[PDB]
UniProtKB/Swiss-Prot annotation:
Cell compartments where the protein resides: Cytoplasm, Cytoskeleton
Protein name (record): Dynein heavy chain, cytoplasmic
Residues of the full protein shown: 1524 to 4092 of 4092
Organism from which the protein derives: Saccharomyces cerevisiae (strain ATCC 204508 / S288c)
Function: Cytoplasmic dynein acts as a motor for the intracellular retrograde motility of vesicles and organelles along microtubules. Dynein has ATPase activity; the force-producing power stroke is thought to occur on release of ADP. Required to maintain uniform nuclear distribution in hyphae. May play an important role in the proper orientation of the mitotic spindle into the budding daughter cell yeast. Probably required for normal progression of the cell cycle.
Family to which this protein belongs: Belongs to the dynein heavy chain family.
Length: 868
């Protein structure tokens, strides 16, 4: 097998074939004709190789087109397959470049397309026509003679139309393949002619793919490159034959822009959407436009995970592009292993490691490899990526074009309410041992005292593990369970009808009671004003309990494991920074990444528990498969007081996502970090991170970064409001800030200091950087109207109603501008209606959002009370 593996190392195309076909290729090398049958597997484009019994004349595609090589390959008896196969591999690329420069030279010498089509292959005439078209339209953008070139292209279209009907079946597909491109050229010229000035013309021209050539290269295979929206991509001269061409449409060019934007930062491209929209067809057309044969990987179609790993190592050596067609339909073990392999490939690309460990095999990594993931529509909604791949890919939305008996009767009801919280969500679990342990704390009219102190202890202990909504549900429910048994029925009817006014079950206005005005009438006063936060918090204020902070639970409880799950909006690391510094411990941050990260993690765990330093495990959800194998057995069983005295461990989880194992989650204490910072606070937090690395481009980049910080804080502020604003909850990370900042530096580095690029930057942000995840067009219009407000502006912007941002001065001092923007952030005062004033949605929508969450809380507590 080692002889075969070394043979694969000599010729990396052999990875695609397999054992059985390769044994015949190695054996039958003398006869030389049987190898041609396997060539479609190891090339993908061509079908068979033509011989003249002495040399190789050329190769033919799967369609029938014959390609003739320049230098013929000699054959003898004492020769191996790898030698002539490598000579053929380089020779077809040189013959493609030869016919390309010959086509371009003939076309430059005023020739007809009809004579050229009958003589040169399709790919050469396609690339040469694209180069001459963009070359003449670049000077046409200055001279503004679109009609002159429009009539010539229309005459060439009609000339190829008359030659199409009088054409044989072989050349007919070549002619159709050139007409779809010529219709795209005419459509672009037609859109450019109707523009008002050069501004719309350059905004339109930035999105169209431009094919340029290098004159001073002397490195012929790397001469032609492709520019789009400011990014460059090198054309590889790989033979593609005559593939079918999609109709050029705006959404196809948007998909091409998303792919080149992800590839510019060496990020993996991936897009979900309903089936039948042409995801893989778009990826293959993107590869054909750059002269690449995209290898497609079938999913869940009688494929064994072994051959997939052989194809991944082979595509990682050749430097070809791989597309995972319909990735969602996979088994959990195969999906986990392939997602791990994709994580290693993308991390090796981003970092730049020459050699990577795949299949426990050391192997070189060519920098040209790329992986794309198409996702069929899910059944709970749209399908999603595994947690490990989210931080490495860029998603796109692609569519079509007797004292103890009275104690006990209350106790079993309290435990039942907490049990219904445990069946509602997997994180809100509770066992009976914790209930008795919390019950022991109550000691350190006797019934009338111990019952009230028990209610205070239950709300003081178990509230920290629940989120704000369930906190208010538990507070109102326990207040009802206490007051219904002690007081009379009139108190029950008044509180029940007021809860039914908070909900929409039954609205009545009874008499309050008689001389109970001091005890009540306050919730009625909050009801008649339609204010929901004070009315929901009155039940909490009745407890008279200091709300336990996370510091109080970690200090008070005596345990070594804690898991604080939270939404993707915030992270509990910064709270641990101050809490561990206040406790004067330390704070390891062990990230759970790849297999090397896992080995370093288990090493640091096994040493840190003995040393006693605190450690943190960020994003435990992505490595949950490793958790149930190793971490579960490790931390499930308590060992002794050696680890209890010094060591304490923290784990960061996410509420929305995969479910953690039940014994590990029940063993550890649970907290939910739910502290949401303000808009101005998020602006200062994003602005503070910028001067660490520094800005070297120019003074305008400081201003663009300040505008991007305000834009990111306003989208994140609108994200939380689910019924009003965004249709559903879209998650935005700092990767969008990184991609928008790099696009801003790219547009500022290549353009003069005029105010013009603000036409094309805004759409790029609202459609690619931030508009990528969004699928509903209404939310895309919200992001568009917000970015149109934050960017366009002359000497006065007034993003928020109070503050106005002036343009940078002539002095061009970047440190003075940094001090000016910090002074302009210090003078501001955040108003009380900032959620309604800074965001352009009206305040009545804010009141409607509060009414909806109050209705959900009142309905859930009424339902919980009726069952018991």
């Amino acid at each position: 097998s080692t002889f075969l593996e070394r043979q694969r190392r000599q010729f990396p195309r052999f990875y695609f074939l397999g054992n059985d076909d390769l044994l015949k290729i190695i054996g039958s090398g003398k006869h030389h004709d049987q190898v041609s049958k396997f060539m479609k597997k190891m090339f993908g484009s061509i079908e068979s190789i033509i011989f003249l019994e002495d040399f190789i004349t050329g190769v033919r595609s799967v369609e029938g087109e014959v390609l003739n090589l320049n230098e013929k390959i000699e054959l003898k008896d004492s020769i191996q397959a790898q030698e002539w196969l490598n000579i053929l591999d380089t020779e077809i690329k040189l013959s493609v470049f030869t016919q390309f420069r010959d086509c371009l030279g003939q076309l430059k010498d005023g020739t007809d397309i009809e004579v050229v089509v009958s003589k040169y292959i399709f790919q050469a005439i396609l690339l040469s026509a694209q180069v001459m078209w963009t070359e003449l339209v670049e000077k046409c953008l200055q001279t503004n003679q679109f009609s002159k070139y429009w009539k010539e292209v229309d005459m060439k279209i009609k000339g190829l139309l008359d030659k199409l009907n009088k054409s044989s079946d072989n050349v007919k597909k070549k002619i159709e393949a050139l007409l779809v491109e010529y219709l795209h050229f005419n459509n672009v010229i037609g859109q450019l002619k109707n523009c008002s000035t050069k501004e719309e013309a350059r905004l339109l021209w930035a999105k169209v793919q431009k094919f340029y050539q290098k004159n001073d290269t002397l490195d012929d295979l790397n001469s032609v490159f492709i520019s789009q929206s400011g990014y460059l991509l090198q054309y590889k001269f790989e033979y593609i034959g005559i593939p079918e061409r999609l109709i050029y449409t705006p959404l196809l060019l948007i998909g091409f822009a998303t792919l080149t934007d992800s590839l510019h930062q060496k990020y993996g491209g991936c897009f979900f959407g309903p089936a039948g929209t042409g995801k893989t067809e778009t990826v293959k057309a993107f590869g054909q436009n750059l002269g690449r044969v995209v290898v497609v990987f079938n999913c869940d179609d009688s494929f064994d995970y072994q051959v997939l790993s052989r194809l991944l190592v082979g595509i990682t050596q050749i430097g070809a592009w791989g597309c995972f067609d319909q990735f969602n339909r996979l088994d959990e073990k195969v999906l986990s292993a392939v997602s791990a392999n994709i994580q290693q490939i993308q991390n090796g690309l981003q970092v730049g490691k020459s050699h990577i460990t795949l299949l426990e095999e050391e192997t070189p990594l060519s920098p040209h490899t790329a992986v794309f993931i198409t996702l069929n529509p899910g059944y709970n909604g749209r399908s999603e990526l595994p947690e490990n791949l989210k931080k490495s890919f860029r998603e796109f939305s692609m569519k079509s074009p007797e004292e103890y008996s009275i104690i006990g009767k209350h106790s079993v009801k309290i435990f039942s309410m907490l049990e219904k919280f445990g069946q509602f969500h997997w994180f809100y679990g509770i066992s009976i041992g914790q209930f008795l342990s919390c019950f022991k704390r109550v000691f350190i009219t006797r019934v009338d005292e111990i019952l009230w102190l028990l209610y205070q202890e239950v709300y003081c202990q178990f509230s920290t593990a629940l989120d704000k909504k369930f906190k208010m549900i538990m507070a109102m429910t326990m207040f009802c369970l206490y007051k219904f048994d002690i007081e009379s029925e009139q108190y029950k009817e008044a509180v029940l009808t007021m809860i039914g006014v908070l909900s929409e079950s039954s609205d009545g206005v009874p008499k309050l009671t008689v001389d109970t005005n001091d005890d009540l009438r306050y919730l009625w006063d909050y009801v008649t004003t339609k204010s929901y936060i004070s009315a929901l918090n009155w039940f909490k204020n009745e407890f008279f309990v200091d709300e336990w902070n996370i510091a109080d639970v970690v200090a008070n409880s005596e345990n070594n494991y804690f898991t604080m799950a939270s939404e993707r909006d915030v992270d509990g690391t910064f709270k641990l920074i101050e809490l561990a510094k206040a406790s004067k411990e330390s704070l390891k941050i062990i990230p759970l990444g790849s297999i090397e990260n896992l080995n370093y993690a288990q090493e640091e765990i096994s040493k840190s528990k003995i040393e006693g330093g605190w450690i943190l495990l960020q994003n435990i959800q992505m490595s949950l498969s490793w958790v149930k194998t190793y971490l579960h057995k490790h931390v499930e069983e308590t060992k002794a007081a050696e680890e209890h005295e010094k060591f304490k461990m923290f784990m960061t989880c996410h509420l929305t996502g995969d479910k953690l194992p039940a014994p590990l989650l029940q063993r550890t204490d649970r907290v939910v970090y739910e502290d949401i910072p303000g808009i101005l606070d998020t602006v200062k937090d994003l602005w503070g991170s910028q001067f660490f690395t520094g800005k070297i481009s120019g003074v305008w980049s400081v201003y663009c970064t300040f505008l991007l910080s305000w834009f990111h804080a306003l989208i994140t502020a609108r994200t939380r409001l689910v019924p009003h604003g965004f249709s559903k909850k879209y998650y935005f990370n700092d990767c969008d800030f990184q991609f928008a900042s790099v696009y801003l530096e790219n547009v500022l580095a290549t353009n003069s200091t005029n105010n013009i690029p603000w036409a094309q930057v805004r759409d790029h942000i609202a459609t690619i950087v931030y508009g990528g995840k969004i699928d509903e067009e209404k939310d895309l219009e919200v992001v568009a109207k917000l970015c149109a407000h934050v960017f366009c502006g002359s000497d006065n912007l007034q993003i928020v109603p109070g503050v106005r941002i002036p343009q940078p001065l002539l002095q061009q001092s970047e440190e003075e501008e940094r001090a000016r923007l910090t002074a302009i952030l210090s003078n501001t005062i955040e108003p009380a209606d900032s959620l309604s004033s800074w965001l352009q949605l009206p305040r009545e929508s804010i009141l409607d959002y509060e009414r909806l969450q109050a209705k959900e809380v009142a309905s859930s507590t009424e339902q919980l009370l009726q069952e018991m």
